[PDB]
């Protein structure tokens, strides 16, 4: 169980709202000592911020692994000549950061990895017997966004989990897509979010294999239109049979209307949804699933021999979760006027011990014992042991969004008690000291 | 307890030695399906290779944290104007990868982070009361090596843990340095390595606060000169008191001659090292610790108010561990004619189950139940459930370096027996099917 004394940590709280922050998540990430801008759209993750980033990453990896995807890692830099194979090199646009090395070879900072994962696959896989195959990584990307804005939510250097599926045909690809559909429901639910799968912009094919998972938010950059029954639907549990038929889960989550502004058609919204169920708002895109078929396998000649002995190009899909963007989206969805309210699964620490009389022998000893006992038992524990008054300590503890606070003072200890406070709702309970660790 | 079936994994084994690989680590990482070259010196980490990389990373993290260092993350792209503050922008050389963004703003892919970490520090810290402070990250770096070579050992895009200490004065900085020296001894020992601390190149004003930690290996690029006695010294255990005097540990590890070629002096060597103890050999630099004083805090104005109430520049030090390079160094030190021999702490899996008659109802069933039981007991386990002959499975298991093998076949099972083989020495053991989990757990 991770453990830190605030005095041996690095957590620079800002007293004042930063004028450069336009939205609440950006404001709070800066105020709560989580983030520092290094260039437009390019950030250092300060210790508290990095802890959350890592919690998010691990939840994503866990669900990808559950769904059968296999983790690897591609480099940040890629050869232009690879992108020339697919014809994306000259068609991608100015968001692609192009680089020349000392030998004048043409490189780029990868904005995504379709060509590269296809290059890897086609080196090693030649039989339909290796498929379905889903390979993924969690890696830093760069898109040279014209106007970086909104802190971690519209920047340039961002962290993404990007997964790529390989199948013999469209039928198998739909099964691979369904696996990721289910994994994403579970991923965002585990973060305390209702990220709704919404039908999204398709490619030149058309079809129905394009969804964006969007958390409803009014500072959000995506316009959306939904049927409110979608917000009530049940998320599959951890025993979901990923080798089985997933269609019933998908049917459930798509049986009721949900579309982004790209594929939204005002006349359909009415023939399906009751007027009292209809809602038109805005949101943050945190996940994207997309079938692309033979887009890369045709141009890059990524073929496998089929059950019938003929070679044919594979069918692929891509699945992205914006891991660094999620820090912003989560704060947008989970805060109040006193600061952040971390869902437990993503919080940097689960409990903070607040010593209300720093230097008094009895309160110090009590906090020292709690801190030691909580860590011994696997609990992520922050000990606020700074030379600050109680009210100073409450405000910082509230701001940074730690799920639980333990208040320790001379007053409470005279009676053998400490106060336990829940951040989400302000529940408070004056407990015996010997009971508090049995949570 | 991590678990995988080979049929559900991605592990591209190469039959032949790749002609582009000049050294054993490079050859084996390609053969064992751990690595793919994407450009000169730039690699993708295939699933097996990535697993080992992450094991290495976590041991490094654990020892930094134990020593009181605090993890953050800096971005890979940095502003040229930051490097103009310190004067290093134009001094660094052609190994720096310069980049222009769409607005013609001047960026670079960070080769290191002294300027950036000092910039973060100076924004927030103003009192001597905040010190000592050591901030670190584990992040991808770029050095445009003129001639990338030797796979992960002399590439361009690489993973480093880099830490940076901040202190009021040189005395405090020496205490910060000692803590990292001890952390490094523990770090490399936990990976099954003897990464020897040796005196290394100092800066302008010289001194005694530069060391490199070097794994001896025939194919290494560092030339070193040591008293062989340094090879048998004791590594501090996990209960080392990082807030105490570490001077006795440092003294012991610096009591015999050990120097890289950059600072080696023949006269001193001959004088301090008995002839039969002298060893001049090659090695791989895996750790580097270096006190730089006020080099960045002078130019970048990172002062704090000290005990005397006056403001003065801080004293800093940098500490780098070559995380990706360590896969190469580990294999160089840990292999035989049949492939890799992973130390258990960095192995991608601890045990592999070799089904020697794939499709046989009883061998499948016994393998399936060993696989489930080992997972449950928290063991990193791989089950080679592929449709391949015994010889093929034996060759692949030896190659990829899994510490233990369980060989499960008709002939063994007739006796209710399985064979447990230890990769390191090839020691074999026939033992009951029930007793086998209990021996490994």
The DSSP annotation for B13-37 comes to --SS--TT--SHHHHHHHHTT-EEE
Beta strands A157-167 and A315-322, pairing class: antiparallel
What DSSP state is assigned to residue B132?
S
Angle B382-B386-B390 (CA atoms, 0-180°, nearest 5)? 95
Pick among A58, A77, A120 to test the B interface (most B CBs inside 10 A): A77
HSE, CB side, 13 Å, CA atoms: give it for residue B424: 9
Tell which residue, A316, A382, A56, has the closest CA to residue A191. A56
Tell which residue, B401, B405, B403, has the closest CA to residue B335. B401
Tell which residue, B337, B335, B369, has the closest CA to residue B353. B369
Please state, in angstroms and as integers, the Cα–Cα distance from residue A18 to each residue in A35, A327, B96, following that order. Answer: 12, 18, 34
Please return the burial class of A37, using the count of CB atoms within 10 Å of its CB with bins 0-12, 13-18 and 19+: middle
Cβ-Cβ contacts under 8 Å for A292 (sequence gap 6 or more):
A114, A203, A316, A317, A318
CA distance B221 to chain A (A): 23
CA distance A176 to chain B (A): 14
Report the C-alpha gap between A402 and A404 in whole angstroms: 6
- The three-class DSSP label of residue B236 is coil
Residue B1 at interface with chain A, using a CB cutoff of 8 Å: no
How big is chain B by its Cα radius of gyration, in Å? 25
Tell which residue, A341, A326, A337, has the closest CA to residue A404. A341
Pick among B33, B48, B75 to test the A interface (most A CBs inside 10 A): B75
Report the C-alpha gap between A56 and B280 in whole angstroms: 48
Tell which residue, B28, B40, B91, B13, has the closest CA to residue B334. B28
Report the C-alpha gap between B237 and A53 in whole angstroms: 31
DSSP element (H, E) containing A336: strand A335-336
Q: Can you read off the two tokens belonging to residue A406? A: 């333990």
Using CA atoms in the order B158, B164, B170, B173, what is the torsion angle rounded to 10 degrees?
Answer: -100
Query: How many C-beta atoms lie closer than 10 Å to residue B132's C-beta?
Result: 17
Please return the burial class of A120, using the count of CB atoms within 10 Å of its CB with bins 0-12, 13-18 and 19+: buried
Residue found under tokens 């904005």: A111
Report the C-alpha gap between B15 and B388 in whole angstroms: 14
Cβ contact (<8 Å) for A73 and B50? yes
Report the C-alpha gap between B138 and B363 in whole angstroms: 44
Cβ contact (<8 Å) for B79 and A157? no
- The three-class DSSP label of residue A213 is strand
Q: Can you read off the two tokens belonging to residue B365? A: 């069933």
Report the C-alpha gap between A293 and A33 in whole angstroms: 44
Distance, CA of A140 to chain centre: 13
Residue B298, beta-bridge partner list = none
Residue of B nearest to A116 (CA): B38
Q: Can you read off the two tokens belonging to residue A76? A: 């940040």
Report the C-alpha gap between B393 and B397 in whole angstroms: 6
Cβ-Cβ contacts under 8 Å for B429 (sequence gap 6 or more):
B419, B420, B421
Residue B236 at interface with chain A, using a CB cutoff of 8 Å: no
Report the C-alpha gap between A249 and A235 in whole angstroms: 9
Nearest to A75 among B72, B146, B157 (CB): B157
Domains and CATH numbers, chain A: 1-340 (3.30.930.10), 341-439 (3.40.50.800)
Helices B323-333 and B47-66 meet at what angle, rounded to 10?
Answer: 110
Q: What is the 3-state secondary structure (H, E, C) of A125-174?
A: CCEHHHCCEEEEEEEEEECCCCCCECHHHECCEEEEEEEEEEECCHHHHH
Residue B80 at interface with chain A, using a CB cutoff of 8 Å: no
Q: Which residues of A touch B74 (CB under 8 A)?
A: 38, 44
Beta strands B97-100 and B77-79, pairing class: unpaired
Do residues A222 and A283 touch, judged by C-beta distance below 8 A?
yes
Tell which residue, A348, A342, A377, A436, has the closest CA to residue A4. A348
HSE, CB side, 13 Å, CA atoms: give it for residue B411: 5
Do residues B193 and B215 touch, judged by C-beta distance below 8 A?
yes
Residue B388 at interface with chain A, using a CB cutoff of 8 Å: no
Query: How many C-beta atoms lie closer than 10 Å to residue A67's C-beta?
Result: 24
Report the C-alpha gap between A130 and B392 in whole angstroms: 18
- The three-class DSSP label of residue A61 is helix
Cβ contact (<8 Å) for A157 and B43? no
The DSSP annotation for B191-221 comes to TT--EEEEE----TT--S-EEEEEEE-TT-S
Distance, CA of B140 to chain centre: 13
Pick among B1, B54, B102 to test the A interface (most A CBs inside 10 A): B102
The span from the first CA to the last CA of chain B, in angstroms, equals 12
Q: In this structure, is the dihedral angle defined by the CA atoms of residues A43, A45, A46 and A52, taken in order, positive or negative?
A: positive
DSSP element (H, E) containing B268: helix B266-272
Q: What are phi and psi of A36, to 5 degrees?
A: -140, 130
Pick among A72, A78, A113, A119 to test the B interface (most B CBs inside 10 A): A72
Do residues B350 and B404 touch, judged by C-beta distance below 8 A?
yes
Using CA atoms in the order B403, B409, B413, B415, what is the torsion angle rounded to 10 degrees?
Answer: -90
Residue B140, beta-bridge partner list = B159
DSSP element (H, E) containing B59: helix B47-66
Residue found under tokens 């499960």: B408
Report the C-alpha gap between A438 and A435 in whole angstroms: 6
Please return the burial class of B65, using the count of CB atoms within 10 Å of its CB with bins 0-12, 13-18 and 19+: middle
Beta strands A106-109 and A77-79, pairing class: antiparallel
Report the C-alpha gap between B277 and B162 in whole angstroms: 34
Helices B170-189 and B47-66 meet at what angle, rounded to 10?
Answer: 140
Q: Can you read off the two tokens belonging to residue A316? A: 């692929």
Report the C-alpha gap between A163 and A177 in whole angstroms: 11
Q: Can you read off the two tokens belonging to residue A121? A: 């696959």
Do residues A122 and A57 touch, judged by C-beta distance below 8 A?
no
CA distance B146 to chain A (A): 8
Cβ-Cβ contacts under 8 Å for A281 (sequence gap 6 or more):
A216, A218, A224, A226
Q: Can you read off the two tokens belonging to residue B196? A: 């020897």
Q: Can you read off the two tokens belonging to residue B54? A: 């992450």
Please return the burial class of B100, using the count of CB atoms within 10 Å of its CB with bins 0-12, 13-18 and 19+: middle
Q: In this structure, is the dihedral angle defined by the CA atoms of residues A422, A423, A428 and A434, taken in order, positive or negative?
A: positive
Please return the burial class of A147, using the count of CB atoms within 10 Å of its CB with bins 0-12, 13-18 and 19+: exposed
- The three-class DSSP label of residue B141 is strand
Q: How many helices (H) and strands (E) does chain A have?
A: 12, 24
Report the C-alpha gap between A413 and A433 in whole angstroms: 8
Do residues B214 and B286 touch, judged by C-beta distance below 8 A?
yes
Method used to solve the structure: X-ray
Q: Can you read off the two tokens belonging to residue A353? A: 């011990």
Do residues A177 and A208 touch, judged by C-beta distance below 8 A?
no
Distance, CA of B299 to chain centre: 32
Q: Which residues of A touch B133 (CB under 8 A)?
A: 10
- Give the burial string for A308-328 (b: 16+ CB within 10 Å, else e): eeeeebbbbbbbbbbbbbbbb
Report the C-alpha gap between A224 and A260 in whole angstroms: 4
Residue A48 at interface with chain B, using a CB cutoff of 8 Å: no
Do residues A339 and A29 touch, judged by C-beta distance below 8 A?
no
Query: How many C-beta atoms lie closer than 10 Å to residue B394's C-beta?
Result: 17
Q: Can you read off the two tokens belonging to residue B40? A: 């000169």
Report the C-alpha gap between A80 and A109 in whole angstroms: 10
The DSSP annotation for B355-396 comes to ESSTT-HHHHHHHHHHHHHHHHTT--EEEE-SS--HHHHHHH
DSSP element (H, E) containing A376: helix A361-376
What DSSP state is assigned to residue A374?
H
Q: Can you read off the two tokens belonging to residue B130? A: 């905040």
Please return the burial class of A65, using the count of CB atoms within 10 Å of its CB with bins 0-12, 13-18 and 19+: middle
Tell which residue, A231, A239, A221, has the closest CA to residue A286. A221
Residue A77 at interface with chain B, using a CB cutoff of 8 Å: yes
Cβ contact (<8 Å) for A76 and B146? no
Cβ-Cβ contacts under 8 Å for A58 (sequence gap 6 or more):
none
Residue of B nearest to A79 (CA): B39
Interface list for A 113-142 with B (CB within 8 A): 116, 119-120, 123-124, 133, 135, 140, 142
Distance, CA of A414 to chain centre: 45
Q: Can you read off the two tokens belonging to residue A293? A: 């078929």
Residue B79, beta-bridge partner list = B107
Residue of A nearest to B135 (CA): A10
Residue A93 at interface with chain B, using a CB cutoff of 8 Å: no
Query: How many C-beta atoms lie closer than 10 Å to residue B317's C-beta?
Result: 23
Cβ-Cβ contacts under 8 Å for A436 (sequence gap 6 or more):
A370, A406, A418, A420
Report the C-alpha gap between B32 and B218 in whole angstroms: 21
Report the C-alpha gap between B200 and A358 in whole angstroms: 45
Tell which residue, A375, A340, A356, A329, has the closest CA to residue A48. A340
Residue A35, beta-bridge partner list = A45
Q: Can you read off the two tokens belonging to residue A401? A: 């969004």
DSSP E strands in A15-113: the ranges are: 35-39, 42-45, 70-71, 77-79, 97-100, 106-109
Q: Which residues of B touch A53 (CB under 8 A)?
A: 73
Strand order in the sheet with B106-109: B77-79, B106-109, B97-100
Do residues B329 and B25 touch, judged by C-beta distance below 8 A?
yes
Residue A68 at interface with chain B, using a CB cutoff of 8 Å: yes
Tell which residue, A54, A46, A35, has the closest CA to residue A10. A46
């Amino acid at each position: 169980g991770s453990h830190m004394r605030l005095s041996r940590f690095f957590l620079p709280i800002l007293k004042e709202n930063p004028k450069e922050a336009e939205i609440v998540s950006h404001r709070l990430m800066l105020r709560a000592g989580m983030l520092r801008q290094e260039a437009a759209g390019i950030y250092a993750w300060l210790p508290l911020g990095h802890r959350v980033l890592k919690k998010i990453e691990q939840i994503v990896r866990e669900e990808q692994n559950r769904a059968g995807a296999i983790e690897l890692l591609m480099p940040t830099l890629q050869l232009a000549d690879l992108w020339r194979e697919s014809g994306r090199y000259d068609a991608y646009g100015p968001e692609m950061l192009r680089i020349a090395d000392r030998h004048k070879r043409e490189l780029l900072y990868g904005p995504t990895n379709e060509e590269m994962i296809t290059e890897i696959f086609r080196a090693y896989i030649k039989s339909y017997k290796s498929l379905p195959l889903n390979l993924y990584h969690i890696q830093w990307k760069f898109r040279d966004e014209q106007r970086p804005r909104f802190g971690v939510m519209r920047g340039r250097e961002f962290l993404m989990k990007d997964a790529y599926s390989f199948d013999v045909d469209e039928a198998g690809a739909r099964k691979s897509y369904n696996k990721m559909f289910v994994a994403y429901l579970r991923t965002f639910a585990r973060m305390g979010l209702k990220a709704i799968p919404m039908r999204a912009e398709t490619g030149p094919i058309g079809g129905d294999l394009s969804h964006e998972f969007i958390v409803l938010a009014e500072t959000g950059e995506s316009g959306v239109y939904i049927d409110r029954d979608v917000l009530n639907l049940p998320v599959p549990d951890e025993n979901v049979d990923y080798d089985g038929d997933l269609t019933p889960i998908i049917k459930q989550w798509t049986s009721v209307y949900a579309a982004t502004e790209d594929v939204h058609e005002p006349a359909r919204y009415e023939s399906e949804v009751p007027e009292a169920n209809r809602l038109n708002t805005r949101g943050i895109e945190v996940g994207q699933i997309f079938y692309f078929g033979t887009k890369y396998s045709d141009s890059m000649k990524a073929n496998v021999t089929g059950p019938d002995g003929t070679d044919a190009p594979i069918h692929g899909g891509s699945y992205g979760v914006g891991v660094s963007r999620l820090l912003g989206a989560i704060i947008e969805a989970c805060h109040d006027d006193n600061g952040i309210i971390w869902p437990e699964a993503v919080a940097p620490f689960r409990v903070t011990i607040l010593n209300l009389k720093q230097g008094d022998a009895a309160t110090d000893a009590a906090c020292d014992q709690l801190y030691r006992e909580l860590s011994a038992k696997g609990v992520d524990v922050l000990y606020d042991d700074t030379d600050q008054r109680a009210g100073a300590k409450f405000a910082t503890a509230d701001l940074i969004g730690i799920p639980w606070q333990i208040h320790v003072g001379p007053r409470g200890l005279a009676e053998g008690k400490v106060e336990l406070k829940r951040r989400s709702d302000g529940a408070r309970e004056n407990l015996a000291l010997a009971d508090v660790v049995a949570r």
